[PDB]
Amino acid sequence: ARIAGVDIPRDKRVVISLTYIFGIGRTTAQQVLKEAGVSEDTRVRDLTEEELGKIRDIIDKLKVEGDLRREVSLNIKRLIEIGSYRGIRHRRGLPVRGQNSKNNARTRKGPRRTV
Amino acid sequence: KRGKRIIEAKKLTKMFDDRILFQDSPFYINHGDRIGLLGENGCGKTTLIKMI
Amino acid sequence: ARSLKKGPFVDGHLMTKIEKLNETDKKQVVKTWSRRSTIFPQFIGHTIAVYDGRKHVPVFISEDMVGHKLGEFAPTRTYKGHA
Amino acid sequence: KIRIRLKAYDHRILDQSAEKIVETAKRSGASVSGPIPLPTEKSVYTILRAVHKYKDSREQFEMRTHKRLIDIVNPTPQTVDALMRLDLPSGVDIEIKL
Amino acid sequence: QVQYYGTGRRKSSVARVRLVPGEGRIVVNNREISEHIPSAALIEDIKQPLTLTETAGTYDVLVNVHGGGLSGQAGAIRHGIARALLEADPEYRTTLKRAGLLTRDARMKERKKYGLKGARRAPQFSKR
Amino acid sequence: PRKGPVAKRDVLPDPIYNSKLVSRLINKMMIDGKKGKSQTILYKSFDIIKERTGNDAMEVFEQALKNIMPVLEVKARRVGGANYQVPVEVRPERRTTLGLRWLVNYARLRGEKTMEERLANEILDAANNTGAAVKKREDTHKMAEANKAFAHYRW
Amino acid sequence: GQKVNPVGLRIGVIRDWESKWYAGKDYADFLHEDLKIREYISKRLSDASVSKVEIERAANRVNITIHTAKPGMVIGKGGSEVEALRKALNSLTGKRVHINILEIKRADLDAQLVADNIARQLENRVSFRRAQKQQIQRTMRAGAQGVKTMVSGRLGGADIARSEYYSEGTVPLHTLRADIDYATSEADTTYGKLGVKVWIYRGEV
Amino acid sequence: AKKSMIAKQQRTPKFKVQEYTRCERCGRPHSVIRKFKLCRICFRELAYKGQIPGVKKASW
RNA sequence: AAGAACCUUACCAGGUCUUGACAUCCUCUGACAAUCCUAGAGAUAGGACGUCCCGGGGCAGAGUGACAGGUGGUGCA
RNA sequence: GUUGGGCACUCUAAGGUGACUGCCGGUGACAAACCGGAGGAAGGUGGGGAUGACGUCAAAUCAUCAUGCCCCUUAUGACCUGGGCUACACACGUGCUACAAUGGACAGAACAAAGGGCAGCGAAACCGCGAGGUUAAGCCAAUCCCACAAAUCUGUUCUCAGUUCGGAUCGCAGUCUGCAACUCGACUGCGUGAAGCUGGAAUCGCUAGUAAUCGCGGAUCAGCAUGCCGCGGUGAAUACGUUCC
Ligand SMILES: Nc1ncnc2c1ncn2[C@@H]1O[C@H](COP(=O)(O)OP(=O)(O)OP(=O)(O)O)[C@@H](O)[C@H]1O
Numbered sequence A: 001a002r003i004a005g006v007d008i009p010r011d012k013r014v015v016i017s018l019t020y021i022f023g024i025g026r027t028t029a030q031q032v033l034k035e036a037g038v039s040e041d042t043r044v045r046d047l048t049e050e051e052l053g054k055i056r057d058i059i060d061k062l063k064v065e066g067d068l069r070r071e072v073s074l075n076i077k078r079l080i081e082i083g084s085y086r087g088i089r090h091r092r093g094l095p096v097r098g099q100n101s102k103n104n105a106r107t108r109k110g111p112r113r114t115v
Numbered sequence B: 001k002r003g004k005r006i007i008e009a010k011k012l013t014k015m016f017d018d019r020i021l022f023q024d025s026p027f028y029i030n031h032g033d034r035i036g037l038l039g040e041n042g043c044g045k046t047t048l049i050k051m052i
Numbered sequence C: 001a002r003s004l005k006k007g008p009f010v011d012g013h014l015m016t017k018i019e020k021l022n023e024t025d026k027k028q029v030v031k032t033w034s035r036r037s038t039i040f041p042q043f044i045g046h047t048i049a050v051y052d053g054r055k056h057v058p059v060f061i062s063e064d065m066v067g068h069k070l071g072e073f074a075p076t077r078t079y080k081g082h083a
Numbered sequence D: 001k002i003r004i005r006l007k008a009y010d011h012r013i014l015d016q017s018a019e020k021i022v023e024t025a026k027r028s029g030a031s032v033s034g035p036i037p038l039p040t041e042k043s044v045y046t047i048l049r050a051v052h053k054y055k056d057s058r059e060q061f062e063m064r065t066h067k068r069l070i071d072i073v074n075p076t077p078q079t080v081d082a083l084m085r086l087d088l089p090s091g092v093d094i095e096i097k098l
Numbered sequence E: 001q002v003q004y005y006g007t008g009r010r011k012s013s014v015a016r017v018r019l020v021p022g023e024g025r026i027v028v029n030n031r032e033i034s035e036h037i038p039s040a041a042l043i044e045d046i047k048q049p050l051t052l053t054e055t056a057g058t059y060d061v062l063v064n065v066h067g068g069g070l071s072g073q074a075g076a077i078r079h080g081i082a083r084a085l086l087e088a089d090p091e092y093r094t095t096l097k098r099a100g101l102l103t104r105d106a107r108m109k110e111r112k113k114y115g116l117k118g119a120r121r122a123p124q125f126s127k128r
Numbered sequence F: 001p002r003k004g005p006v007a008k009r010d011v012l013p014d015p016i017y018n019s020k021l022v023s024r025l026i027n028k029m030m031i032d033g034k035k036g037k038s039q040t041i042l043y044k045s046f047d048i049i050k051e052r053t054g055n056d057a058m059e060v061f062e063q064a065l066k067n068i069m070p071v072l073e074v075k076a077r078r079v080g081g082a083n084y085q086v087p088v089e090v091r092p093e094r095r096t097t098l099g100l101r102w103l104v105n106y107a108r109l110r111g112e113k114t115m116e117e118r119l120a121n122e123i124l125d126a127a128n129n130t131g132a133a134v135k136k137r138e139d140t141h142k143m144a145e146a147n148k149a150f151a152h153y154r155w
Numbered sequence G: 001g002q003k004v005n006p007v008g009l010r011i012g013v014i015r016d017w018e019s020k021w022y023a024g025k026d027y028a029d030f031l032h033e034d035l036k037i038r039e040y041i042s043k044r045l046s047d048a049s050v051s052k053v054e055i056e057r058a059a060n061r062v063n064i065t066i067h068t069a070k071p072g073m074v075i076g077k078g079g080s081e082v083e084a085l086r087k088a089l090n091s092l093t094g095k096r097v098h099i100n101i102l103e104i105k106r107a108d109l110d111a112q113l114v115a116d117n118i119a120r121q122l123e124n125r126v127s128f129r130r131a132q133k134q135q136i137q138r139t140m141r142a143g144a145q146g147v148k149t150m151v152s153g154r155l156g157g158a159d160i161a162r163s164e165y166y167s168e169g170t171v172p173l174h175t176l177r178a179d180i181d182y183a184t185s186e187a188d189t190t191y192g193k194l195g196v197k198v199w200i201y202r203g204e205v
Numbered sequence H: 001a002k003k004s005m006i007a008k009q010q011r012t013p014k015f016k017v018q019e020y021t022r023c024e025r026c027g028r029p030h031s032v033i034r035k036f037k038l039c040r041i042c043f044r045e046l047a048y049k050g051q052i053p054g055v056k057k058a059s060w
Numbered sequence I: 001a002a003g004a005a006c007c008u009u010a011c012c013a014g015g016u017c018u019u020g021a022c023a024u025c026c027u028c029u030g031a032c033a034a035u036c037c038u039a040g041a042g043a044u045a046g047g048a049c050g051u052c053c054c055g056g057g058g059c060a061g062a063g064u065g066a067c068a069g070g071u072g073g074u075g076c077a
Numbered sequence J: 001g002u003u004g005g006g007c008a009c010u011c012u013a014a015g016g017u018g019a020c021u022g023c024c025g026g027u028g029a030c031a032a033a034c035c036g037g038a039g040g041a042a043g044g045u046g047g048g049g050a051u052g053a054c055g056u057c058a059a060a061u062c063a064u065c066a067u068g069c070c071c072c073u074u075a076u077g078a079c080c081u082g083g084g085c086u087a088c089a090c091a092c093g094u095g096c097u098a099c100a101a102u103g104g105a106c107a108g109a110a111c112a113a114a115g116g117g118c119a120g121c122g123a124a125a126c127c128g129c130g131a132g133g134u135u136a137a138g139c140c141a142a143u144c145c146c147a148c149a150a151a152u153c154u155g156u157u158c159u160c161a162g163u164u165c166g167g168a169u170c171g172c173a174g175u176c177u178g179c180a181a182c183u184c185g186a187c188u189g190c191g192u193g194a195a196g197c198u199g200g201a202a203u204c205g206c207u208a209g210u211a212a213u214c215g216c217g218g219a220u221c222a223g224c225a226u227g228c229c230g231c232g233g234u235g236a237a238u239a240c241g242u243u244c245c
């Protein structure tokens, strides 16, 4: 069940399997099925080549997988290049949306290195 | 760390031609269980493993 | 985040300074305290010395900066790591 | 009809004041809708008892606004006078709508 | 027609019960009790005063009930029924009182107390 | 407490089986005051018990508890250097309490996907007394018998 | 940090508010005018033995009733001083002020008067022991069932401050029905502030 | 509060957003109750004296 | 702390002031002012426009030296 | 409940009644008192709240306020912009959300209490996927509004996975408040989808409408709470006992 170069789970309902492509979430998926008139409830393994064909055409109009990864990477490269405050936070591994850093912020900083 | 359940069997029956090894045998194995298979030779211990 | 209806905000006292520099095609270092001012296209090429709390930091404005706030390029806190 | 709303912090003067209102209208002859006891409002303020720190030490005060409604049915011209002529003690709010 | 009234109260709920000659139909706010009260356990408890007096099928219980939850309303309907039965027949008083159906369960939500997180629940304590 | 024994609390008999024991188990299964969930679990379990065994669910359940309820428990006592486990008889009420508690806890640990199925299997095992809950009862009886010497000690 | 103000505990139970008016929208405005009026009366009548100042309101009127032990000194000759006060309060409030003076018959039963009297004596370098003991006798003669007095601070210019209290008869502070008057006062000495607390118990209600 | 601070707060600031409340008895900036325009401390002091109409100690 | 974007705010950098941002005196005089235009980041200046409310009940400014002023220290006064 | 009509019932709130070991039996000194019973809504200070003795800790606060003494006075006072109080190798306290099937998602039927509202609450209608927006009814309020309570129940789907669990972080695009959301706001949409599989030593709260869990409101407040103060909904387990801390 390869779509946009991603082998979507065959056993899962269509709405859910679509979300395995980088750049598609639950709502996005429902629209694609809505636009392409496919039932959400059918399992991916049970999809006909026609329905699969239709889904693939619609998904080509969205920015997914490498496309999206390249777009977002440029955004990060842009912020640092212009020497923004946000750029500095990104490269330094600190919160960029004003979260306090005295406590928490372990998603950005990684595991504690006690001293 | 992983999840609780790892093996479940419901109404599990294994036959060879006309010989029933075991029939309607429900059991489970959870994470971290240390299970000893007890039984005489030929009772099907290795058979169950190959099924698992 | 500023409502689109309101439009981008930029302290007029700073915009006025840039309009005079643009009419004469001149490029002086404009000292400002308006960290909150949006970078408009009109600023491109100029050098604005933005107060960071103790000194005006000259920040060169490139095209890629338009829409950000002046303050965004003049960090106010000093930190070179613990040790 | 003539609608009277009495408010007060002290229900006692409220009852005393309301009594004066009802009798003066009834002696004027107009029928009186007995003073309706409306739900008492209760605002509560919890404040820090101490001047500094000691967050767990609080003190609670409340203000209870008692209300009464007096409707006057079948009014008379002399009644309207008697209603305004009454001097009810300070601390009772009188509202006369008609 | 001939009807016997009873006020019952549980927690926040108040139930105005009227016993009328009928066949055991409970209508609460113009609905079959099953629609209003899902729980089977609650419906069993509600009927309890009727069972103890062996009056199931004698009376239609018309209940107007407001406030509180579906378990408090159930409690209030039961209490109102017991009191209504007293009017129908003073002889029932002994059995109802023995089973504790005439007592108003006076348990009410305790107020929250400053410095505590509920009525009793104290905040986590630390020596160090 | 020091003053003296305190009034225990009554439970109403279950609406379907007219049993106080069933009602008590329902309370033991309940979490976060959600009595609805627990009643549904138990009724579904009893259907599995009747549908599986064919016997009456209540009879199976009562037989299971009989096999779980302990008669002698052990109470710890610090006697000088070493701590002694003193065997003590289990009050009838406590026997029921321990049975339901042990049943519920070990049922939750089983490997079936749903609690009702889990609970059903656990009760069936206790009916044949071969489940975890049974084992717990074996352990306490072993401890009491082993430390039978120290029964003399007591408060 | 132990004993609730005896008056606070009994307000609305047995004791009434001095401010006896109701307001809605204007509540904040009215409250603060009364604060300025009370302060003004306290200063202008600091020597006139003014215990209690009740304040009423009506439309634009303000009916002030000042309770004093020395009504003569507040009214003045032919109402000269009381008319002067009216004019001063009409200019502050910007309202029509009416003033009534009530005579306190037994000056020594009013906790505020007593607290102020003792404070004046502490400022005149009278022994704190004598001041308190003398007052307590006078008050008990007036028929109070009990009295407690306390003076705190640098008693006789000591380095280490302490409190010394004297009592007579019964002062049941914990009895909510007991009409227990209470009042504080401060004395400014060369060594700083001496606190004065007075409790007077005049019987049950 | 410094007399300067009470004066600044009583003047109209550059912007309406900059207006804030102080207890107008003692000048405390924190814990000012709109209904009374008093800080927590002044409120208690005057309540105990019976000088806050219709306020009494709460219990229930 | 029952609400740190400015304010709050007491801290720091920079730009500023000195009967003073706040108060009672003294005196002189008479409105102060508001409102814009220009300059400034703003405080502030520069101009402009009017130019006292009822002996002073006042209100205001200008000078004047008494003073003000401190969330400065000591809660072990 | 809309109109007429009524206030019966509920409810609202003033004044009353009620609980006193007052009565019955035993025990006890015959005393105090204790154990049980009746009646009753309630039985042994019914439940909760307020109320905190003499003193202790030279406890806390000179930063609410006030104040002795000392110190500064073209400055330790006063004004202004910007910044900081939000920093971040790291340790601790108190919380929130979770690790899932007694659950997630979707849909339907319900059921509260208590409080707030005049420059305030703001309906209905219309627009937007949404935060919101236009217009604007009603209400200075037992009337109008905030205001749809949520768990729960009933169906459908998911089928044990780091997932349709979990929501951090981050990218993009927006809304509202405000002179102004860069440092440093809340919320929304799209995308992204971290740790986390019930937690070592140890340690905390709670004796019943309590714990646990589910929502709702309020103060502060232009805006901003997982905090604080209140409200109800569902609603347990256990107390044998005083050997031990
Ligand atoms: N394909 C087969 N056909 C028929 N009989 C078989 C077959 N495979 C196994 N058996 C018999 O069935 C039983 C299964 O043997 P298996 O090796 O699976 O288990 P076991 O005897 O428990 O193991 P162990 O080798 O550990 O003793 C033995 O009797 C074996 O002889």
Ligand SMILES: [Mg+2]
Pocket: B045, B046, B047
């Ligand atoms: Mg083998």
Ligand SMILES: [Zn+2]
Pocket: H023, H024, H025, H026, H027, H028, H038, H039, H040, H041, H042, H043, J064
């Ligand atoms: Zn104050």
